[PDB]
């Protein structure tokens with residue numbers, strides 16, 4: 083991979099983010115992106131500020147310049163798609179920062195694990211093309227064939243890990259270059275385990291494992307830590323419904339458009355198009371959000387908060403408030 087330039091770094095470093103608190107649970111990334119005509123630079127500056135503010139990179143021998151180079155190498159591998167773009171991963175990083183520090187989940191993890199989770203957020207969807215794992219398998223695309231042949235159906239998640247490893251193989255963008263031995267190994271393994279756990283086909287089993295470990299006072303400590311990391315990255319990845327309504331709605335619009343684009347390509351290839359991906363089904367945004375709330379997000383957040391993560395109660399409260407607001411949209415239609 084080609085080295086990040088001085089000029090690229092400077093375009094991020096000029097962004098001052100006046101009037102934003104990147105640590106706040108009501109921080110608004112959409113407003114941040116509308117605040118200037120260089121939203122990719124503002125997004126990178128948000129990630130840079132979150133990581134320096136944690137005080138963690140400093141502790142692990144990662145210089146300011148190596149951090150910024152890493153952020154920019156991640157940025158170059160995100161595509162111009164409606165949802166799974168650079169803004170999604172910065173949002174996940176910011177959201178995880180709030181879970182760790184506003185929700186006090188940092189108390190369950192080492193400082194290194196906190197640092198790994200914040201970094202992992204930025205790599206977890208590298209080179210996403212706006213198509214899900216199912217698309218690659220149904221169309222027998224080359225990447226799908228490779229996944230089936232090699233025995234792992236998490237087509238995208240393995241791909242994301244490959245590209246993360248590539249970025250980290252150059253010292254100038256290796257945020258773990260200050261580590262060695264077991265610490266270095268833990269950093270890479272925990273990052274990869276977390277990325278692999280973001281495949282939604284593994285949602286129920288990842289949640290059940292975490293819950294069983296949290297309930298067991300004799301759970302293996304290293305295993306509990308690892309599952310806690312996995313669960314936090316998953317939480318960030320389905321956190322759009324835990325945000326103030328207008329932010330939540332803007333994420334819902336972006337993800338719907340990305341799904342519809344997949345369905346349009348699936349039609350053209352003559353493969354199965356699920357209702358959720360079909361433009362001509364006209365499905366209402368409100369009903370889709372209520373369904374995602376009721377069947378995925380509300381139970382996930384309630385269960386993890388009740389099991390262990392009491393400081394994250396606000397997520398459950400905001401989901402409830404958003405559900406009531408979508409119900410008002412239906413009531414008044």
Ligand SMILES: COc1ccc(C2=NN(C3CCCCCC3)C(=O)[C@@H]3CC=CC[C@H]23)cc1OCCCCOc1ccc(-c2nnn[nH]2)cc1
Pocket residue numbers: 280282319320322323330333334335337358369370371373374377378
């Ligand atoms: C802003 O709103 C979203 C944000 C993210 C998503 C995602 N979605 N998903 C999948 C989508 C297909 C199967 C359902 C599981 C979630 C991803 O993999 C994406 C990649 C990784 C993390 C979550 C992302 C979806 C978002 O809205 C989707 C709204 C449409 C309705 O959704 C429902 C979802 C399940 C039910 C259901 N009923 N019974 N059991 N389950 C009913 C309705």
Ligand SMILES: [Mg+2]
Pocket residue numbers: 206207238280
């Ligand atoms: Mg993903």
Ligand SMILES: [Zn+2]
Pocket residue numbers: 170174206207280319
């Ligand atoms: Zn994601």
